[PDB]
Design a protein around this ligand. Structure first.
Ligand SMILES: *[C@@H]1O[C@H](CO)[C@@H](O[C@@H]2O[C@H](CO)[C@@H](O[C@@H]3O[C@H](CO)[C@@H](O)[C@H](O)[C@@H]3O)[C@H](O)[C@H]2NC(C)=O)[C@H](O)[C@H]1NC(C)=O
Ligand SMILES: *[C@@H]1O[C@H](CO)[C@@H](O[C@@H]2O[C@H](CO)[C@@H](O)[C@H](O)[C@H]2NC(C)=O)[C@H](O)[C@H]1NC(C)=O
Ligand SMILES: *[C@@H]1O[C@H](CO)[C@@H](O[C@@H]2O[C@H](CO)[C@@H](O)[C@H](O)[C@H]2NC(C)=O)[C@H](O)[C@H]1NC(C)=O
Ligand SMILES: *[C@@H]1O[C@H](CO)[C@@H](O[C@@H]2O[C@H](CO)[C@@H](O)[C@H](O)[C@H]2NC(C)=O)[C@H](O)[C@H]1NC(C)=O
Ligand SMILES: *[C@@H]1O[C@H](CO)[C@@H](O[C@@H]2O[C@H](CO)[C@@H](O)[C@H](O)[C@H]2NC(C)=O)[C@H](O)[C@H]1NC(C)=O
Ligand SMILES: *[C@@H]1O[C@H](CO)[C@@H](O[C@@H]2O[C@H](CO)[C@@H](O)[C@H](O)[C@H]2NC(C)=O)[C@H](O)[C@H]1NC(C)=O
Ligand SMILES: [Ca+2]
Ligand SMILES: [Ca+2]
Ligand SMILES: [Ca+2]
Ligand SMILES: [Ca+2]
Ligand SMILES: [Cu+2]
Ligand SMILES: [Cu+2]
Lengths: 710, 715
C-alpha cells in the first residue's frame, strides 16, 4: 500500500519514538503521571505528514517513499523558564534525530498556552480539597456532599477555558458539581477561580469565589458569611433526570427490537491497512491524535478529487450569568480532539455489520494507549434510491421501471472530550458524491440556575441552566480536481427581460446562467454577511466530452453565523469562523487552521487564519485549498435532558461532481434493476446480479470500556 | 383508528358511487374521459373533500358526531356554447343525494382555457400534428429517420410545455419534437411547434409558428419549401436504433474495484413496530392519520406525540420548475405540478429499491382523467429504517483508562413515502418521524431532466449534456402547508436570536466581557411573520402554546428549513401571480376555511389570473397572537444541469424540506420512554454488566421475492 505514507503511527512506532527520546538523559524526561508540573515530559507523539511535493512524486511519478517522521511535543517544566517545544523525530523505522520545529521569536506565553493534563487535574483537586476546608459544613448543609471523607457523596468540578483575561495567564473558573450519574448536570451554585500558573502547586490559590449570584473573595469569607446568616443559600426510585435509564410510557409501547442490517455476503469495500476501495472510490485515511479524522488521496474512477479532507477545529462559544459561563470558549483541539475516540458500541454507534478498527494514541499518557473500536467503516442502505424512473405509457401501463437501490459507505469516528460526544462521518455515495458530517450528542455545558441566567440560556431542571452557545467546526478541503492545478468559479441565475421572439408585443422575463471567475484570494473569502453563491465550483482546465470544464461542487449544510466581533480579543483564535468558505493557495506553512495551543492562549495563538489571506495571492490555475466553516446556534431546551440528540443536530458539506464525468458515474453499478413489459406474459425483470434474500447473524454484542497500553 | 377515517381518501366503492350519482343526472349529458372530442361534458376528477376543521375537531376532541363525508367533483362542461369548468361537492357518503356548488368563481371568464390537459386532448393534438406536418414528412425522414405519419417503431413524439400563451384565456402550446426511443425525453430533434388548441372543435386547431435549429419559419409549408430549396442549415441525426443508448439506465463502464454481491439489506424478523390500520398510524409516541389527495399529494393529519396534538395538517401544496431557454419552448416553461394531478401519478413502488423490502406497501385508487376509478398498486409505503446514527450516545470516561458507563440508543425512523411521476421527473415525498418527537418533510428529485435541442445560444440558459442536448437552467420550488396546532389550536409565533452584550468583567473590572445573550422577538401581525428571501431568517422559528413546561418555559415546536431556494421571478410580474407563495421561505397566516390551499389544478394554465393568490392571504395583516396559525414553507433549489444528470438526476444532495422539533414542549427528552436504550456498566474484577430493557436480537427472516406489475387499471 502506498496509502501507508498517510498512516498513523503503530504501537511499535510510538514505542520507538518514546524509547528514543527517553534514551536522551539530558532531556530529564519523567512520566505524564508524575504529580508535579516542574518536570519534563513528552505530551504527544503523532505521525508528521511529509511535504505534499514529495508525497505526490511518490504517488504519481514513481519516486521514493518520503521519510516517515513523528511530531513529538515536549513540555519542558523542569527548567528556570518553562516552555513547550516541538520536534520532528525520525526516521521511522530506526529514529536518529530530533529536530526542533516552529520557533516564535518574542512570544513569551508558551508554558501558559499548553493543554491541561491528568497530573495537573490531580493537583487542582488537591488544591480544592485543602482550600475549601473552611466550607466543609456549608457543603454538607447545602448539598449533602463534600470533598472530605465523601465516598459516594463527593463534589467534583468542571473547568472552563480560556483561563484568564490575557496571554500568559492560567487562572481557571471551576464549576462545582455533585459527582453522580451524569454529574455534568448537577451544579451546586459555587464557582471558584484558581490561579495555577506556577510550576509549584503549593503557590496555587483560590483568588475568587462566586456563590448563587454573589462574589465572596475567599472560601474563608463565604464560610464566615454563611455562619453569620449573610448568605442566600440554596439547599439542593425513578432514575435521576441526568440518567439515560428509561422512564415514562409511550401511548403505543414498543417491546421488540427494530429492523437491523444484515450483510451475509460480506463487505463490498476492500480495506487494507488505511487504504479503502469501494466501487469507483479509492482513498486513504488517518486519525490525527491532535485534530481528528482525515481522508486523503481521494480518487473516483482512478482520478484524484481531493488530496486532503480533514477536521481542523471544533468550538463551542458560550454566554452566561455566572463567571464560568461567561468565560467559556471551548476549542477541542486544545483537548486532543483526535485522541478521545472512545469505543464504538456495535449495533448502536455503528451497525452490527460494521468493520470496527482499533487505533493507538500517545496523548498525555505514560505509554502508547490502545483504543478499541476507535473507528468503524460500513456500507448502509440510505432508504432512498440513488435514481429511479417510472416510464409510463400514459394508457394504464409502462415502457419500463428502472431503479438503483441507495447505498453509502461511511467512515466514522467520535470525539468525547468530556460532556459532549461528536460523531464524525465521511460518507461516499456510488455516484462520486462525498459528504462530511458531524452530529452532536452527549451532555450540554450547564451552570447553576438563578433568574439572571434566563438572559443567557434556558432553565432545564430545578437548579440547572443550559447556557446559550454556538457550535463552529472548521474543515480543510484540499481539493485537487483531476490534479493539482485548479481554478475557482461560481454560477448564479440572473433574469433577462427580452422581447418575446414569437409575439413581439410581449416580453419574456426568464433565467439565464451567469458565471463569475475569481483571480485573487480575497475575492473568494466569503463572509457571513455576503450572499453565498448557489454553485461553488473548483475547476480543472480539462473539459468533458461536451465542452464543459471538469469540476467538483461544494455544497454547505450549516446554520452558522458570525459570533464574536472580528478583531476583538479571543476572536483572534478563530478568525476562520469569519468565513463559511475561504480559498487559499496551498502552502506548507498553512496546513492547519488551529493548534493544541489555541484553547489556552486565544489572544496570541501560533496560527491566525486571517493572515493566510494577507498576501492576497493569485488563485488562477494554482493548487487551491478550500476551508469550510459549519455550525449552529444551540439554545438549550428541556428535550436536551439528559442528552442532546442527533436528529436535526448535524452540519457538514457535500462534494458533488459537476461536468467531471461524461455521464452519471454510478452507471457502472451492476445493482441496477430494470423491469420491462412483455406481450401476453409476465414482465422481464432485468438484473446484472442475482436477487438475494439471505439472512445471517452478526457477532453477539460486547463492549469493553477500557483503553490501556499493550 | 376508526376516527382517522374522517381524513381518509375515497374507496373504489365510494368513487364508483359518486360517479354513478353524477351519471344518473341525464341533464349533465356526461360522456367518458376517453371520448376524442373536446366538445363534451365529462367528470375530470373525484376526490374526498375534507370537512370543516371546526366540525372535525368537535368529532375528534369533544365526542360529537362524525361530520358528513363528501367528494369533490370537477366537471368539464365542454358541450355548450360557452364552455367552462365547474366543481361540486357530492354527498353524503354513503348514499349520495346532492351536488352543491364548490369553489365558485363568478365573473371569471377563462375557466375553460385554465383546465388541465387530458389524454383525449393529447390524442387530438397528435392527429393535428400528423395532418399539419405532412409537408415536412420528407424533411423528417431525411433529418431524423423518424416520422409522424405511417410510423411503427420510428415514431416522432412531442413534449408540451406550459403555460400556454401570453395571457389569461389562451391555450397555445409550444411542443418540443422528439424521437420516441428509450428515454425519449433526451432526444429533441431541433424542431418546436406552436399549436393553438383553444377551440372545442379540433378541426380549427393550427400550427401557428415553427421553430427549427435557431430560426422561426411561420408554417410547416414554409420550412418544407426552404428545406427543399436548400436554404436550411439542417442537423442530420444519427440512427439511435450493442452499447446502451445514453438515455438508458442499462449499466456500462466498470468500477476499478469490482462489486459482485448484493449490498447489506434490512431484515425485520419481529415485524413492524408501528401499528398501521386503515389510514391511522401509531409509532411509539406518535399518532397520525394520512391521505393522498389526488390533486395535490401526500398529507399527514391530526399529528400527536405523547397524546398531545402538534399539527392538524402537514401537506404538499405545489411543486414548480421554472425554466429559462434559448428555444421558444424552453423560455416558455414554468411547470406547476398540481395542474397535472401531482397526487395522482403515484406509480408503483419497487420493493427493495423505492422502499426497503421490509416496508409495508399500500395500494390506492384515483379518479383523475379516467373512465372509471383506477387501481394504483404500491402507491405508498410505510417503513421503519435504521438511520445509521444513534439518537443519543455518551461515553462517560473516568479519564484514567476506563469508564463509568456507556449509554446509547440505536437510531431508527418511521418513513411514510409516496412518489409523483407526472412525465420526466420522479419526486419522492417523505414524511419522517423520529422517536424523540422530531418530524421531517423531505422531497428528493430523480428521473429525467427537461431538455431542449442544442445550439450555441443555449449555453446562456443551460449546459450541453450530449451531442444535440441542452439541460435548461431552472429552479425547483415546493410549497408546504404546515397547520401546527401546538398543544391545541391557539398559538403564537416568536423567534430567538443571539445578541452580544459588552459589559464590565464582574471579577476583573479593568476588563470587558463581550458575550452572547438570548434575545426573544414576539410577532403580533401576519406581515411581521412573512419572511422574504432578502430578509434575515431567524435561527429559531417557534410556534408556541401559552402552556408552560415544568421549568417555566412556553411549550413550543420549532421549524427548521433545509433549502437553497431564493426569489426567482419578479414580484408582481405576469405569471409570478401564480406563485406568490414563493416570495416567502416562511409565512404565517390566520386559519380560514377559504384559504386551505396555496395553489390549484387551474394555476398551471392560467398563471396570470389564478383562483388563489397566496399574497392575498397577507393583505388583511391579521392579528396572530393566540390564534389558530398556519405556517407555510417554501423549499427548493437552483438546478443547473450537468453531464452527471444523464440519463437521470440522482438523489444524493438533491433533497429539500424541513424539520419540526419540540422546544420546551416536553419536560425532558421524550425518547426516554424507549426501551431500546442500552447502558453498559463496569464491574470490579469482572465483565461489564450490559443493562437492557429489550433482549438482544439476532433473529432472521426473509422478504418475499421481488415482483413488479407496472399496470394501473380499474377493478
Ligand atoms: C358553466 O356551465 C354550467 C353548465 O352548463 C352552467 O350551469 C348551468 O346554468 C344553466 C343556466 O344557463 C342552467 O340551465 C337552466 O336554465 C333554465 C332557464 O332557461 C332554468 O329554468 C333551468 O332550471 C336551468 O337552470 C343549468 O341548470 C346549470 N347547470 C348546472 C349543472 O348547474 C353554469 O352556469 C356555467 N357557469 C358560468 C359561470 O357561466
Ligand atoms: C525551551 O526549552 C528548551 C529545552 O530546555 C530550550 O532548548 C534548548 O536550547 C538550548 C540553548 O539553545 C540548547 O543548548 C539545547 O540543545 C536545547 N535543548 C533541546 C532539548 O532542544 C529552548 O531554548 C527553549 N525555547 C525557547 C524559545 O526559549
Ligand atoms: C421588462 O421590460 C419591459 C420593456 O421595457 C417593461 O415594460 C415597460 O414597462 C413600463 C412601465 O410599466 C411601461 O410604461 C412600458 O410601456 C413597458 N414597455 C413595454 C415594451 O412593454 C417591463 O416592466 C419589464 N418587466 C420587468 C419585470 O422588468
Ligand atoms: C477488556 O479487554 C482486555 C483485553 O482483551 C481484557 O483483558 C483480558 O482479559 C482476558 C479474559 O480474562 C484475560 O485472559 C487477559 O489476561 C486480559 N488481557 C489483557 C491484555 O489484559 C479485559 O478483561 C476486558 N475488560 C472487560 C470489562 O471486558
Ligand atoms: C466594549 O466596550 C468597551 C468599553 O466601551 C470598549 O472599550 C473601549 O474601546 C475604546 C477604543 O474604541 C478605548 O479608547 C477605550 O479606552 C475602551 N474602554 C474600556 C473601558 O476598555 C470596547 O472596544 C468594546 N468592545 C467591543 C467588541 O464592542
Ligand atoms: C398485474 O396485475 C394484474 C392483477 O393482479 C394481473 O392480472 C391477473 O393475471 C393473472 C395471471 O397471473 C390472472 O390469473 C388474472 O385473471 C389477472 N387478473 C386481472 C384482474 O386481470 C396481471 O397479470 C399483472 N401483470 C403483470 C405483467 O405482472
Ligand atoms: Ca495566501
Ligand atoms: Ca488543492
Ligand atoms: Ca390573513
Ligand atoms: Ca394551527
Ligand atoms: Cu450545543
Ligand atoms: Cu431539476
Amino acid at each position: 500500500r502506498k496509502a501507508g505514507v498517510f498512516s498513523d503511527l503503530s504501537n511499535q512506532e510510538l514505542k520507538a519514538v518514546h524509547s528514543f527520546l527517553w534514551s536522551k538523559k539530558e532531556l530529564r524526561l519523567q512520566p505524564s503521571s508524575t504529580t508535579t508540573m516542574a518536570k519534563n515530559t513528552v505530551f504527544l507523539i503523532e505521525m508528521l505528514l511529509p511535504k505534499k511535493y514529495h508525497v505526490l512524486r511518490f504517488l504519481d511519478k514513481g519516486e521514493r517513499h518520503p521519510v516517515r517522521e513523528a511530531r513529538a511535543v515536549i513540555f519542558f517544566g523542569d527548567q528556570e523558564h518553562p516552555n513547550v517545544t516541538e520536534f520532528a523525530v525520525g526516521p521511522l523505522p530506526g529514529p536518529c534525530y530530533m529536530r526542533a520545529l516552529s520557533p516564535r521569536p518574542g512570544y513569551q506565553s508558551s508554558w501558559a498556552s499548553r493543554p491541561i493534563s491528568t497530573a495537573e487535574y490531580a493537583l487542582l483537586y488537591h488544591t480544592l480539597q485543602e482550600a475549601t476546608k473552611p466550607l466543609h459544613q456549608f457543603f454538607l448543609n447545602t448539598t449533602g456532599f463534600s470533598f472530605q471523607d465523601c465516598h459516594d457523596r463527593c463534589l467534583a468540578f468542571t473547568d472552563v477555558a480560556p483561563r484568564g483575561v490575557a496571554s500568559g495567564q492560567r487562572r481557571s473558573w471551576l464549576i462545582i458539581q455533585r459527582y453522580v450519574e451524569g454529574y455534568f448536570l448537577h451544579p451546586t451554585g459555587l464557582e471558584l477561580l484558581v490561579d495555577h500558573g506556577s510550576t509549584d502547586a503549593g503557590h496555587w490559590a483560590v483568588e475568587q469565589v462566586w456563590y448563587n449570584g454573589k462574589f465572596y473573595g475567599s472560601p474563608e469569607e463565604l464560610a464566615r458569611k454563611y455562619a453569620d446568616g449573610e448568605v442566600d443559600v440554596v439547599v439542593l426510585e425513578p432514575p435521576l433526570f441526568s440518567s439515560h435509564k428509561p422512564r415514562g410510557d409511550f401511548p403505543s409501547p414498543i417491546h421488540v427490537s427494530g429492523p437491523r442490517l444484515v450483510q451475509p455476503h460480506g463487505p463490498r469495500f476492500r480495506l487494507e491497512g488505511n487504504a479503502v476501495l469501494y466501487g469507483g472510490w479509492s482513498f486513504a485515511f488517518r486519525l490525527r491524535s491532535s485534530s481528528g479524522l482525515q481522508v486523503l488521496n481521494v480518487h473516483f474512477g482512478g482520478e484524484r478529487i481531493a488530496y486532503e479532507v480533514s477536521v481542523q477545529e471544533a468550538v463551542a462559544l458560550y454566554g452566561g450569568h455566572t463567571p464560568a459561563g461567561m468565560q467559556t470558549k471551548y476549542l477541542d483541539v486544545g483537548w486532543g480532539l483526535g485522541s478521545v475516540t472512545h469505543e464504538l458500541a456495535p449495533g448502536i454507534d455503528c451497525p452490527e455489520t460494521a468493520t470496527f478498527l482499533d487505533t493507538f494514541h500517545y496523548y498525555d499518557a505514560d505509554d502508547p494507549v490502545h483504543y478499541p473500536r476507535a473507528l468503524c467503516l460500513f456500507e448502509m442502505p440510505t432508504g432512498v434510491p440513488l435514481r429511479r424512473h417510472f416510464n409510463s405509457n400514459f394508457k394504464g401501463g409502462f415502457n419500463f421501471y428502472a431503479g438503483l437501490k441507495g447505498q453509502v459507505l461511511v467512515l466514522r469516528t467520535t470525539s468525547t472530550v468530556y460532556n459532549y460526544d461528536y460523531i464524525w462521518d465521511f460518507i461516499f455515495y456510488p455516484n462520486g458524491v462525498m459528504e462530511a458530517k458531524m452530529h452532536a450528542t452527549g451532555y450540554v455545558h450547564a451552570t447553576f440556575y438563578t433568574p439572571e441566567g434566563l438572559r443567557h440560556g434556558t432553565r432545564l431542571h430545578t437548579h440547572l441552566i443550559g447556557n446559550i452557545h454556538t457550535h463552529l467546526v472548521h474543515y480543510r478541503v484540499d481539493l485537487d480536481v483531476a490534479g493539482t492545478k485548479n481554478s475557482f468559479q461560481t454560477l448564479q441565475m440572473k433574469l433577462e427581460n427580452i422581447t418575446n421572439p414569437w409575439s413581439p408585443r410581449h416580453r419574456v422575463v426568464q433565467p439565464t446562467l451567469e458565471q463569475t471567475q475569481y483571480s485573487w484570494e480575497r475575492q473568494a473569502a466569503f463572509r457571513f454577511k455576503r450572499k453565498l453563491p448557489k454553485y461553488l465550483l473548483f475547476t480543472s482546465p480539462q473539459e468533458n466530452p461536451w465542452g464543459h470544464k471538469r469540476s467538483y461542487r461544494l455544497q454547505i449544510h450549516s446554520m452558522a453565523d458570525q459570533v464574536l466581533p472580528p478583531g476583538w480579543q479571543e476572536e483572534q483564535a478563530i478568525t476562520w469562523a469569519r468565513y463559511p468558505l475561504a480559498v487559499t493557495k496551498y502552502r506548507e506553512s498553512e496546513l492547519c487552521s488551529s493548534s493544541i495551543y489555541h484553547q489556552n492562549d486565544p489572544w496570541d495563538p501560533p496560527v491566525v487564519f486571517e493572515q493566510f489571506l494577507h498576501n492576497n495571492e493569485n488563485i488562477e490555475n494554482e493548487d487551491l485549498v478550500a476551508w469550510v466553516t459549519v455550525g449552529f446556534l444551540h439554545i438549550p431546551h428541556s428535550e436536551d435532558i439528559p442528552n442532546t440528540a442527533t436528529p436535526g443536530n448535524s452540519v457538514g458539506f457535500l462534494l458533488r461532481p459537476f461536468n467531471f464525468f461524461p455521464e452519471d458515474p454510478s452507471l457502472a453499478s451492476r445493482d441496477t434493476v430494470i423491469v420491462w413489459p412483455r406481450d401476453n406474459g409476465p414482465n422481464y425483470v432485468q438484473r446484472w446480479i442475482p436477487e438475494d434474500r439471505d439472512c445471517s447473524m452478526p457477532p453477539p454484542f460486547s463492549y469493553n470500556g477500557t483503553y490501556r497500553p499493550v
